[PDB]
Amino acid sequence: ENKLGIINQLELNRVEERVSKENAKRLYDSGDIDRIEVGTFKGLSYIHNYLFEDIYEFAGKVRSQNISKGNFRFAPVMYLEIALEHIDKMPQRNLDEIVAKYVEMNIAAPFREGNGRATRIWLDLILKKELKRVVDWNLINKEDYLSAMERSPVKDLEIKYLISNALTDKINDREIFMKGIDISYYYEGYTEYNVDEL
Amino acid sequence: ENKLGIINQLELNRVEERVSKENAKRLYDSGDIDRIEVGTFKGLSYIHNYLFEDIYEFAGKVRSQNISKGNFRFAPVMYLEIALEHIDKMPQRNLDEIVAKYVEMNIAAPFREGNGRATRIWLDLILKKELKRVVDWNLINKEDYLSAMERSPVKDLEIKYLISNALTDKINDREIFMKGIDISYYYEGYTEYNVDEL
Amino acid sequence: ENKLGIINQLELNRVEERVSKENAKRLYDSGDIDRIEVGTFKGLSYIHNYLFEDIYEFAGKVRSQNISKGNFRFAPVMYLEIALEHIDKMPQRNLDEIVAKYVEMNIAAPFREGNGRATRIWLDLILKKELKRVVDWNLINKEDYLSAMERSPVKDLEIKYLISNALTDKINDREIFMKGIDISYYYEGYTEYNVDEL
Amino acid sequence: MLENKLGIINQLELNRVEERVSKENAKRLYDSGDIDRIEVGTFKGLSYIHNYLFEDIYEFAGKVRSQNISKGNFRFAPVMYLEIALEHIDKMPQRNLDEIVAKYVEMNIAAPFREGNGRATRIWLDLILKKELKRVVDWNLINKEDYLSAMERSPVKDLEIKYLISNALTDKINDREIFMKGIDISYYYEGYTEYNVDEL
């Protein structure tokens, strides 16, 4: 279900990876990433549209159906408008409040697809603005990340620990961002490209 | 925080069990249980107030704070009004729909405390009206019940199975109701009294 | 790490699917599938080797290190032989005992890879011998299957329900088998081929 | 319901007497100084603790179980692995908090006795911490719900229970009140609240 002419899911995986990773590279290199609202659904939507507007019509738009990914209980549509407004007002002064806000937005998962990758970019911008840190994503193991996120609605200690131990002060390091993009796509199983070669 | 003069949590547990079980016995014997709206938040609120109004000021009222217990998130206050209106509109024609409705009201957990006991009484009333059955709670083990309830937000098959294999047609049997009250309190850890001896 | 020199994971996935599916087709059509020990590790090892001896060494052989999948707690290597001996002696007289045996063998997961596909074939042979049934895998939705398997060490009701509702007496229906092979590969994410065209 | 050395046929009364008698034994275990002459960190020592607490009540006290036991959200070790599992736990290191918590988590999964594993193993844990870190747990600093949730999570990831333990560590390793309060809280974790050990 896409804007390109793709009827095969494996081909769509490769093409989505390549086009959206191209867009992520441009998001950083043009400086556009630094002109978006931080910590808000408007900003998250801007990121998501930027990554995916060529591939999906729903890019940047709040979904209309429920989503089902494993046994994780995402927000049902009926709470979604309420949830995002709540998240727009949550504080983000320190690591606890930032992780708590990230966990709430992960539960809300407002888009049909692409929530994890877009929201990881959004999280790094919150960390940069409020703590002058970003996540070095090579300091977070993939299985530990996925397990910690699935656990996070009950207790966010695991995800907090991973993030806190992966914090770096190199908030303008192009290499940290670009490799963070490759790792973020690897978490969701897309590994056909390296973003820096696009 | 209670209407009595109690500073000890264990004494509060003791008196809460005794008073609310006395009220449950009266709810059945007076016939008041037969005059309640079935399957709605209005009826559930009536039950909860009836059990707990001597002990807690919030009895029968939707909570204003979040509650956090076990391995899945109950509805946060900000969703509660939407959730209860939705639950009022859910169907209750067969066991599948009754169990799905019970699972959603358990997730809603609209009161500050006492959700489990009130909602089990409420469930028996839905079963009595729509299937001419009640639950024989002596046919549901505590460990099995708790495990199945914790699983139900993901998949209600386990709780559906326990409930259906405990269904009895003795829907006016006083002793089934009374033992059901003692068992329902045992599920939550209250065992100091026997309801028929109160 | 494989018998061909394939260094790309997406490439290996393609050839592993096609070759091993050819071996599965031959396993059924040659009738060899009917002369393998039913319900024992020896029989499972024969199935696994038959599927994977062309692609992987160690095919049919007990793994030597621990394996992980998500948070699932598979048997550690140091207990594996004990587990396999225990599983060889588990009974298989009715559906309950067969599902329980299948759940223990899923936990044992004795091979480095290919446990799910080999063990699903092994399960169908146990069912055919003991109940004169096989599973119509078309009646078991994928997400329901994976969730049920993850749940099964705690409570095997979900997988038992899915299997019990997918049982067919068409134990010589060649397409039920071959489609079962395609669906079983889809469970693990291999979707490039239809075995009957191989 | 379990066979017991008293003539008790009602589970609620067995709960009451078990709580009373075994809490009495725990008080005497500490006050007699016997707790200081137990092997630390091995199944032999845990077995000694368990027998001390429960031998008046249960024949199986201090003994490896012969059947599986099943509760909660993860499988305890099955009997067929139990001897090997305990042998392994005996050899696990305990030099720092990470290793002690990992060892405690493995022993909680092993759950070698028919019943009473949680209470005996918490005493066993405190003795390990006292020997290797010169700390014990101030159990008043670990909430019940937090404790139980962290334990259920621990076979997957021991971070939550490690956090609770480390943030409750105290150096008062000979404070009798810390111990006695720990006994009452440890029994509260499992739902036994009819007595206070110091009032026994």
Numbering used by the authors:
A (entry chain C), B (entry chain A), C (entry chain D): 10 to 207
D (entry chain B): 8 to 207
What does the original paper state about this entry?
The most frequent PTM reaction catalyzed by FIC enzymes is the addition of AMP using ATP as a cofactor, coined AMPylation or adenylylation. Enterococcus faecalis FIC belongs to class III FIC proteins, which are comprised of a single FIC domain and carry an autoinhibitory glutamate in their C-terminal α-helix. We discover that EfFIC has both AMPylation and deAMPylation activities borne by the same active site. Furthermore, the conserved glutamate implements a Ca2+-controlled metal switch that tunes the balance between these activities without conformational change.
We determined crystal structures of unbound, phosphate-bound, AMP-bound, and ATPγS-bound wild-type EfFIC (EfFICWT) and of unbound and sulfate-bound EfFIC carrying a mutation of the catalytic histidine into an alanine (EfFICH111A). All EfFIC monomers resemble closely to each other and to structures of other class III FIC proteins. Mutation of the catalytic histidine (H111A), of the metal-binding acidic residue in the FIC motif (E115A), or of the inhibitory glutamate completely impaired deAMPylation of AMP-FAMEfFICE190G (mutant panels).
